Amino acid sequence: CVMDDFRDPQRWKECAKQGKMPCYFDLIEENVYLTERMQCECTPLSKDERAQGEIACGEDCLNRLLMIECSSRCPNGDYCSNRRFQRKQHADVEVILTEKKGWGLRAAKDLPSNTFVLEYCGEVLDHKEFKARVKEYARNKNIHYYFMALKNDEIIDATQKGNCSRFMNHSCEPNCETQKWTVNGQLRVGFFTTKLVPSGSELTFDYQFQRYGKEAQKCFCGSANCRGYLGGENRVSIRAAGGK
Amino acid sequence: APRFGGVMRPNR
Ligand SMILES: Nc1ncnc2c1ncn2[C@@H]1O[C@H](CSCC[C@H](N)C(=O)O)[C@@H](O)[C@H]1O
Ligand SMILES: [Zn+2]
Ligand SMILES: [Zn+2]
Ligand SMILES: [Zn+2]
């Protein structure tokens, strides 16, 4: 049961029954909304510059600097290196079973610093849908939580639908960070390495978790500076957790 | 009240 079985629902379901792969969820290539709601100024690379290894819409791209992706109308067209979310230019990753955090993610090759890992895809919810799901997940006695704040009135929920970014565990000393990118006038969240990440190392981010729950989950990241609990010291209200 | 639950906040 390899990484490729995630694209094969019949085989993945079988692997899940044998405990070889995590439980089934729906694999989505972009965010699904339950309730629905410009070009850069880079000089186009010549055929010779492309051949010589020159990057199109690299470090000096006006769109990239502002965390905006380019569209098909980019002056660099096909060569544009600034359409990673759209072109699914995800890093080589593996889903692993951890000792006590459940499933996790790890680098399947060495990843340089500020490398796009994956987009945190899911179902985008409003405050009313978020509160409905809070009750659902609490009534189901769910152990793992998959809510990612997008904007004040938008929560990305990857509990039922998402991608393998839903497997990224918390660390008080992480090797990734989230970045909010504008893709087609819509905001998206992606994970980016903050440092060189050797092959086989678990990919982690700092949740900055806003715990509404009565009880805190203990943190097993193992950092010398570990906060002991996901959520830290304080318990917040559901409305605060939801961004109101 | 939910025994567990919380929201992840994007930060840098
Ligand atoms: N550092 C950590 N310590 C303990 N549990 C962790 C953790 N990081 C993540 N988790 C667990 O993972 C959940 C976030 S979803 C991350 C993927 C998950 N481990 C899975 O098996 O599907 C949390 O609610 C918590 O249960
Ligand atoms: Zn550009
Ligand atoms: Zn471009
Ligand atoms: Zn910790």
Numbering used by the authors:
A (entry chain A): 1449 to 1485, 1497 to 1703
B (entry chain H): 29 to 40
Could you give the paper's own sentences about this structure?
The methylation of the ε-amino group of lysine residues is catalyzed by protein lysine methyltransferases (PKMTs), which can introduce up to three methyl groups with high specificity using S-Adenosyl-L-methionine (AdoMet) as methyl group donor. The SET-domain containing protein 2 (SETD2, also called KMT3A) PKMT was first identified as huntingtin interacting protein 1 (HYPB, HIP-1). It has a size of 230 kDa corresponding to 2564 amino acids and can add up to three methyl groups to K36 of histone H39. The ability for trimethylation of H3K36 makes SETD2 unique, because no other trimethyltransferase for this lysine residue is known in human cells. The structures of SETD2 in complex with H3K36 variant peptides and S-Adenosyl-L-homocysteine (AdoHcy) revealed that the substrate peptide is positioned in a deep binding channel in the catalytic SET domain where several contacts between the enzyme and the substrate peptide are formed.
To understand the molecular basis of the super-substrate methylation by SETD2, we determined the crystal structure of the human SETD2 catalytic domain (aa 1435–1711) bound to AdoHcy and the super-substrate peptide containing a target lysine to methionine mutation (ssK36M). We observed clear electron density for the ssK36M peptide and a cofactor product corresponding to AdoHcy, feasibly formed from AdoMet under the crystallization conditions. The ssK36M peptide is in an extended conformation, and AdoHcy is surrounded by residues of the SET and post-SET domains. The super-substrate carries four amino acid exchanges (A31R, T32F, K37R, and H39N) with respect to the canonical H3K36 peptide. Although not completely resolved by electron density, the side chain of ssK36M R31 (in its most likely conformation ttt18033,34) may form a salt bridge with the side chain of Glu1674. The aromatic F32 side chain of ssK36M is inserted into a shallow pocket formed by the side chains of Glu1674 and Gln1676 making more extensive hydrophobic interactions than T32 of H3K36M. In conclusion, the substituted residues in the super-substrate ssK36M interact with SETD2 mainly through the post-SET domain loop and the α6 helix of the SETD2 catalytic domain. Slotting of the F32 phenyl ring into a pocket between the Glu1674 and Gln1676 and possible interactions involving the guanidine moieties of R31 and R37 provide a plausible rationale for the enhanced methylation activity by SETD2 due to a tighter binding affinity between the super-substrate peptide and SETD2.
